[PDB]
Amino acid sequence: GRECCLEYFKGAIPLRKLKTWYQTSEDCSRDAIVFVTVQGRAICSDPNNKRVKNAVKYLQSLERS
């Protein structure tokens, strides 16, 4: 993986602009979910946060392949 998250976005996931998501490398110090908007903004999130876990559960088909 090329990139890691140093901080977590605490705000509201931008669902209306969401296009894809991925989990950063296991070699990143901070485990993270990155949400990518249609305009390509990338947003680091806490994989243990309840809203993040639910979003990646029901939005499985959005996951980067």
Partner: protein, 92 residues
């Protein structure tokens, strides 16, 4: 504090940043302790791992493990070296 709002500054800095790879299976680490999210200057939190390279050294970085990079820990935006050296490189 109704008169203070820090969330916007933090939200601006919650984007992923480029990290360099290494050969001994330790965590990926960025160059120094600052990064840019959409033009905004951001500082890694204290305790976050980093590589500390002089400007000369940065020019010698490749995509191959032929550079000895001083490992450090971020403190107040400074990459404080801790004595560990590892072969670091850029990931294509």
């Amino acid at each position: 504090n109704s008169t203070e709002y820090y969330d916007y500054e933090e939200a601006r800095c919650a984007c992923p940043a480029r990290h360099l790879n290494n050969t001994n299976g330790t965590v990926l680490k960025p160059l120094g302790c600052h990064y840019f999210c959409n033009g905004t200057l951001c500082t890694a939190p204290d305790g976050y791992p980093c590589y500390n390279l002089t400007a000369q050294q940065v020019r010698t970085l490749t995509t191959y493990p032929n550079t000895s990079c001083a490992v450090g820990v971020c403190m107040k935006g400074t990459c404080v070296k801790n004595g560990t050296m590892e072969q670091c490189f850029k990931t294509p």
